[PDB]
């Protein structure tokens, strides 16, 4: 039979029913863009939801669950079709089945529901998903299944508004301390993206991640073999160093900076860009943190990327330099000058982007003020690489911020 298997799936004969449900799974899983809307319109939803509760026929449960999984892998209203069929408690009950494949499909389906939004994530949590989900983690587990569990964990960690419940985050984090030591690449990428989501959620959640003791296992992943592990780890620790200076200092005490030269010379250019982002957040800190940036020999590399990189990376280098001019000491800005930052920093003054030209003007302004005893020779080294001319031209700019700053810098330091 071909279409009206809506009928066959409501048969006394469990073979007919199972074949029809397997056919519904066939329609919903063979192709590229499954016809979810016709399936929902056809009224096979309540039938498949009933199938979920059939403890006597696990194959029927599995087929129904994978049909519904693919329905809830679709649009927001498509996921709500499954939810409002009121099947989430049924999947939760299937989590306790003695059949691995039924558990796997229940976990998969719940993961698709949780991944829809903060509302559905909180709903699925509220019916008690996390403790059974986390019990599956065992040294005696199939890996194809462990990956699905870690995926669902990532979905539990997402959607900043409102962030996931504090109870649930501190329930998850011990599981992540176990999973971050695993050898599979997929497991680590998902684990570290879970951490990235949490640390992006806010300073309290950052403090939970710090308090879990997992940061010393996270930082060394920055120089891991695989690039996906590296990018996700860089994202997580960058999010952490977005917080307070003491949180940032936890990251630095895990010797995080020793990993970055490799990141600053990595051929992939987004990695350079994000590594200099990280560094810009570090130079925004206190004097000892600027000194850690300096002592890691990252100052010449940042100036190098400022000089020769593309626009995207030069922007981040410019933030790093300006934030160091804001945050630094006598000898620190002096070391920066000894590393010959002035010419490339000035050449960015002519850029299409207003924010970045303003940033370099701010940095220059603070550098002239910073060393008032070299203020004459600093003005000369600026004028040497054509910086005076570009500043006088930005005095002719259409943005109030830019020309007012250019006029202000020309007034204080250029007696000429």
């Amino acid at each position: 039979s071909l279409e009206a298997i809506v009928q066959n799936a409501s048969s006394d004969n469990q073979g007919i029913q199972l074949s029809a449900v397997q056919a519904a799974r066939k329609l919903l899983s063979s192709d590229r863009n499954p016809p979810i809307d016709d399936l929902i319109k056809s009224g096979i939803l309540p039938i498949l939801v009933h199938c979920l509760e059939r403890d006597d026929n696990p194959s029927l449960q599995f087929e129904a669950a994978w049909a519904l999984t693919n329905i809830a892998s679709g649009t927001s209203e498509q996921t709500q079709a499954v939810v409002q069929s009121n099947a989430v408690p049924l999947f939760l009950r299937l989590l306790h089945s003695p059949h691995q494949n039924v558990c796997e499909q229940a976990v998969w389906a719940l993961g698709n529901i949780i991944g829809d939004g903060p509302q559905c994530r909180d709903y699925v949590i509220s019916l008690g998903v996390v403790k059974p989900l986390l019990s599956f983690i065992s040294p005696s587990i199939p890996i194809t299944f462990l990956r699905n569990v870690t995926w669902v964990m990532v979905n539990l960690c997402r959607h900043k508004d409102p962030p996931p419940p504090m109870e649930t985050i501190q329930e998850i984090l011990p599981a992540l301390c176990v999973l971050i030591h695993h050898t599979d690449v997929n497991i680590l990428v998902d684990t570290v993206w879970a951490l990235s989501y949490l640390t992006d959620a806010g300073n309290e959640q950052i403090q939970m991640v710090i308090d879990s003791g997992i940061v010393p296992h996270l930082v060394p992943l920055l120089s891991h073999q695989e690039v996906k592990v590296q990018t996700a780890a860089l994202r997580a620790v960058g999010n952490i160093v977005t917080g307070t200076d003491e949180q940032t200092q936890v990251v630095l005490n895990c010797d995080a900076l020793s990993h970055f030269p490799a990141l600053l010379t990595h051929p992939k250019e987004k990695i350079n860009k994000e590594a200099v982002w990280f560094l810009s957040n570090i130079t925004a800190g206190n004097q000892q943190q600027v000194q850690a940036v300096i002592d890691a020999n990252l100052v010449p590399m940042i100036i190098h990327l400022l000089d020769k990189g593309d626009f995207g990376t030069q922007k981040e280098a410019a933030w790093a330099i300006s934030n160091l001019t804001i945050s630094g000491r006598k000898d620190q800005v002096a070391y920066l000058i000894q590393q010959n930052v002035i010419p490339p920093f000035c050449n960015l003054l002519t850029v299409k982007d207003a924010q970045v030209v303003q940033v370099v003007l701010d940095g220059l302004s603070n550098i002239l003020k910073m060393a008032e005893d070299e203020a004459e020779t600093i003005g000369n080294l600026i004028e040497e690489c054509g910086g005076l001319e570009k500043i006088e031209q930005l005095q002719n700019h259409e943005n109030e911020d830019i020309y007012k700053l250019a006029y202000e810098i020309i007034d204080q330091f250029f007696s000429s």
Partner: peptide, 13 residues
């Protein structure tokens, strides 16, 4: 006290 550090979402236009 201006924008001290720079959050990840800010690091996109």
């Amino acid at each position: 006290e201006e924008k001290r550090k720079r959050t990840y979402e800010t690091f996109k236009s």
